[model samples]
Target: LFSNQIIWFVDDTNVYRVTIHKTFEGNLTTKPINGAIFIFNPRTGQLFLKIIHTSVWAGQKRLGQLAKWKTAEEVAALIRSLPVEEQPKQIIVTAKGMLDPLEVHLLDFPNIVIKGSELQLPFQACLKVEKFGDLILKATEPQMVLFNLYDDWLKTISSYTAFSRLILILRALHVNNDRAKVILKPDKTTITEPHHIWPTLTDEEWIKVEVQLKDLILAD
Candidate 1:
């Protein structure tokens, strides 16, 4: 029903009511909520996360309309949106209530650890204020990966972020010799490291680190 027959909105609206979406620039370039840990209030669907690193936007927060029965997925996207220079090895989530909806969707984020089902907050009067906000158009960071098979076959290397570290550890297991050419069932990557002259895998060696990264996304 058209309320009162006349409520004109804007064209090119990101959402029908997306203009309702408001953003404020934060001084968070200096002090951000260190949020490898997230506190969720399932009753109100109000999410609160504290800073674990205190110096960055632990990703942006998105709250669906207050009356809506929704779990925010924006944070999950934020966590996956990049490979932070100071990324967390894990995330701890706290909430209470029937969470089948939350958990089912977030299963995509494998590194998320559920801490408990009960969370309550008490803040009598927490005042906050700021003025003058700026909007920044968004662009994402692309992490490139590659494989470097050394003159020794046992020393093949290169994958994004954590997988590189995993490969580092795996290389240690094969220290006995380089003649065996040990290979594991590494997953398929749509794109591989660009060819390099220094003995790199010809697109065949770079396994999909994102598959591993899919399990590493965080939320708060």
Candidate 2:
């Protein structure tokens, strides 16, 4: 019953051995026996399955894409795609203790223009989740353009210089979550208001800001 390979079969009278092979019309190279049969442990019937022909398998290729920068309009479109409940409110404040009127317009119209290289005051804004926590995003720094575009504003003998510097400190806080509720005591050395900007801060004042940030974030 079989020819190329060995096989065994049992009958009522006796057991018989057989050699398995293909027919003459099937050559050994092209028409080879590429299948196998398995019998159940307690049954006489057999099941057959085909064998894989090749040893190697092909794999898929992976690709990576770079992130694109979005303009104000594009940003607004992306924000509007989200549900109202998921959107976070944004706030912008100036050093003179006044809020920007554009904040409301931005939220309502969802489209606004942001000028390039304009001097602006430092401000804090965040997105909050009811159960989870708040994620403080961007904090701005005071720029020279905002203070009349004068490069030596900090060196000038004017009170605006100190105020501008404080704005810088506020801007740093906008970027850094650790300075969320930092308290600033008045500096008595100068007759003008304190300028807490990193560039203008005394070594001691800078250290104080550093310590406050470390304490808030528990970063040691």
Candidate 3:
């Protein structure tokens, strides 16, 4: 029942693993806090932990909003009404150029469910951000998710001053269902090669390593 997952590279030696759950709550500002770290011995199923950070985002605020749109047309209308300056950037990040809302939606896979107290998204859903800060929504499902703000936008507009503010919001949000945890188990093979302990690979090499590790785990 792995609903959704994302792997982010925090640095050469650290990574952030996030797993999205199906639990629905009207308010994102409250969630529980619980987590642990373990180092599992693949051969014997024994686990240990060198370090762990719990309730990382508890009561912290961040950017980006999530919402469910009942009708794609309604979502499109809201997007059209936004000021041109606030529209999503059209640029090439990877080999792909100019990301559309549909593409972003697809990345969530199996469709992201939206949960709201009184809103029911129409079929062929979409989401939109409004000038008044109200997120209008339409979704294939009845739920609506609103991300607090856009990460990059908040950073730019607040001149980085918003960092602490968002952190507080996220902290409060973690008051419930914040049991997300992460564990790291160093590869014993790599440990034997002291010189390989450091991450000195280029971005491409890092990607290769990530894929290799995932493939190995999947095969097992």
- Model 3, CA-based lDDT: 0.24
For candidate 2, the lDDT comes to: 0.27
Instruction: Return the TM-score for each candidate structure.
Output: 0.24, 0.20, 0.20
Give the alpha carbon lDDT tens digit for every residue of 1-220 in model 3: 1112211101001111233455566433433222112111111211122121223333544311111111222233433554744332221111111123334433423332211222111111111112111211111222222222222323233422333322222232222112100101223332212222122333454345445443443443
Give me the candidate number with maximum lDDT: 2
What TM value does model 2 have? 0.20
Over 1-220, each residue of candidate 1 has an lDDT whose tens digit, in order, gives 1112211110110100122323375323332211222222221222232212222223434322210112224334444554753222233333332134335545776654433322222110011100000111111321111223222223343222323333232232223112112222243432222332122333344343223322222110
Question: Which residue pairs show collisions in model 1?
Answer: 33-51, 34-51, 34-52, 34-53, 35-52
lDDT of each: 0.26, 0.27, 0.24
Each model's number of backbone clashes? Answer: 5, 10, 45
| Model 2 misplaced stretches (Cα beyond 4 Å) | 1-182, 186-200
In candidate 1, stretches whose alpha carbon ends up further than 4 angstroms from where it belongs are: 1-70, 84-94, 117-220
C-alpha lDDT (0 to 100) for residue 9 of candidate 3: 8
Q: Which stretches of candidate 3 lie over 4 Å from their true place?
A: 1-75, 90-101, 104-158, 176-220
Q: What value does the lDDT take at residue 142 in candidate 1?
A: 16
Clashing pairs in 2: 2-19, 2-20, 3-19, 3-20, 3-21, 4-20, 4-21, 139-174, 139-175, 140-171
lDDT of 1 at 197: 13
